[PDB]
Amino acid sequence: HMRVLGLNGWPRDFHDASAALLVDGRIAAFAEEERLTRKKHGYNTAPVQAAAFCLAQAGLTVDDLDAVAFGWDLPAMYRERLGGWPHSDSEALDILLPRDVFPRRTDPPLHFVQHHLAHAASAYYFSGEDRGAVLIVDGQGEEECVTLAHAEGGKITVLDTVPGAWSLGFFYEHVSEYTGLGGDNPGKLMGLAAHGTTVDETLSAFAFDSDGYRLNLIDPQARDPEDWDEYSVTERAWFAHLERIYRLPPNEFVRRYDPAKGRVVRDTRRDPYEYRDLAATAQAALERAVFGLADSVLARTGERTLFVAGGVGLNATMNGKLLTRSTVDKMFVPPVASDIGVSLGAAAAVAVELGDRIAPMGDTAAWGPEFSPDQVRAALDRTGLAYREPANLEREVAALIASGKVVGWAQGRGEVGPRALGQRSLLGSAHSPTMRDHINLRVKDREWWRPFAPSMLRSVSDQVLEVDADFPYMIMTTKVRAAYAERLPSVVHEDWSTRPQTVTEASNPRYHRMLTELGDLVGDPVCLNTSFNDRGEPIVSSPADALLTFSRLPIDALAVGPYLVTK
Ligand SMILES: NC[C@H]1O[C@H](O[C@H]2[C@H](O)[C@@H](O[C@H]3O[C@H](CO)[C@@H](O)[C@H](N)[C@H]3O)[C@H](N)C[C@@H]2N)[C@H](N)C[C@@H]1O
Ligand SMILES: Nc1ncnc2c1ncn2[C@@H]1O[C@H](COP(=O)(O)OP(=O)(O)O)[C@@H](O)[C@H]1O
Ligand SMILES: Nc1ncnc2c1ncn2[C@@H]1O[C@H](COP(=O)(O)OP(=O)(O)O)[C@@H](O)[C@H]1O
Ligand SMILES: [Fe+2]
Ligand SMILES: [K+]
Ligand SMILES: [Mn+2]
16 A cells, blocks of 8 residues: 655644545545634644544554655745755654654655645546646745646646746735735635626736736736745735725724623724725636636647646636636636645645556545544533434435524535535525525624525536536536526525535435435425534534534534434
């Protein structure tokens, strides 16, 4: 067997710590640090808990590993931006895998994988396609913010890159910050965009061309001498520019004691909804730029299959329009397009180099921890809530959903990536014209303008959606057929878009069975599926997490493992 532990996360200015374990090219385990620590975004940390879980899941120690792989060329970043890489592999391993958690007889081989290559590997090798065009777009790797590459014959060959100062990721983040939604919530900006109108998609900053874009607002070779990426340089340029060209100045954050909460809370001076037009315009600019890049690399490679990864790959709206594009026949974007995925991608790049073949991801992201009935019952008993073990859990949950109840659903291995996919989900009626406001305003406490997304049987997705293909990850939007756009109001957006999950019996028998039962009740085997967490907080992982959230929020029922708890 070849066993490779991929890692992301480092104590110095880092985010999205995660760990993935490949055994013979198959994913044995994969988790995000934030889900285990309950600290959102897994900032500034080696993936200690995620990696400990991976080893425990596979019954392994560090001594059983053929290699440890890290998803950045860290040594090169230290040499370039911080005056040298001070660590021996052994010292680096003591940081990535502290010995108090990871005892070891000796050091496994340590590999650093260039950041965009790791992103690329997480898309290509797990796609089930043997070749295609690679588009990597994020905030910034070691230097570049975009990579165009060719994936073929098991190799990934870089064709071109874009310098960090021209980052589409930084741009989008800075606009997000500017609106008051926050740089850490670009997904909110994506949601806001449909409520607004675009007049000038250049923002007087971008020039567009058939191969991508230009930003004469910033010297493309600008480098921050005081930091190790161009985040701060771009932030200043964008904030100055936006305040100059947009009718509203930056939205400011307000911190004030709230006597009803008994604590200082953070709010915004203006309602971010006010900036909806800027959101629409920023979204259109992003799409325009990426369409160019995508057309370019597809043409240069002679491929019609497109692989996308990097954080900008989380832009499901952009992905859905790329899919629709005349230059694209097939598209694969992994659930872990952000830095969450470079642990997996580093592991894959190394496993391939070591002679393994990588299995397709397979329409599932369920690789985190799962809990047996006994473990769940122990968390249940801890709380002293009454509960049942229904003879047919799936039927009862479907009936609860049909009646307009919101149901927590914590089953099997936790999802990796930012979307709940029927493992750690909050479920509600797709057919209810009030469910959307109820979950936003009452349950998860979100902005009224934020849309929800549906799960549905793959077997009916052709009838429901304007595109007939697998959508296993909720990472692409598409249009709902007019025949259903009115039947499924809670899971449709301002522009008749939806961000669906298609479910196969193979991928998730239980969820599949629940949806089937639901279809017998409401006509369509479709439900609202939002992630099981208070708005803002990390998706719940453990039975105790789920119970804490079930009890803090006005959720009607919780199906956790084989048990059902009702308020
Ligand atoms: N607004 C107040 C906050 O701003 C910053 O955080 C912000 C980070 O600086 C942002 O950037 C981080 O992530 C980006 C990529 O998004 C990396 O390029 C960069 N190295 C890393 O710093 C990240 N994307 C969002 C986060 N809120 C500062 N850490 C201070 C404070 O916590
Ligand atoms: N929905 C979205 N639309 C556009 N950009 C996004 C979206 N979600 C995340 N991003 C971008 O992803 C970038 C971070 O990507 P990632 O590869 O995870 O980190 P890094 O750039 O540090 O390697 C951020 O700049 C953020 O703006
Ligand atoms: N069809 C869609 N079009 C555009 N954006 C969407 C669509 N569906 C969902 N979204 C966005 O996805 C985001 C998912 O929310 P998330 O970050 O998981 O928050 P929470 O913490 O409430 O679970 C929402 O903010 C919403 O804007
Ligand atoms: Fe990245
Ligand atoms: K097409
Ligand atoms: Mn969510």
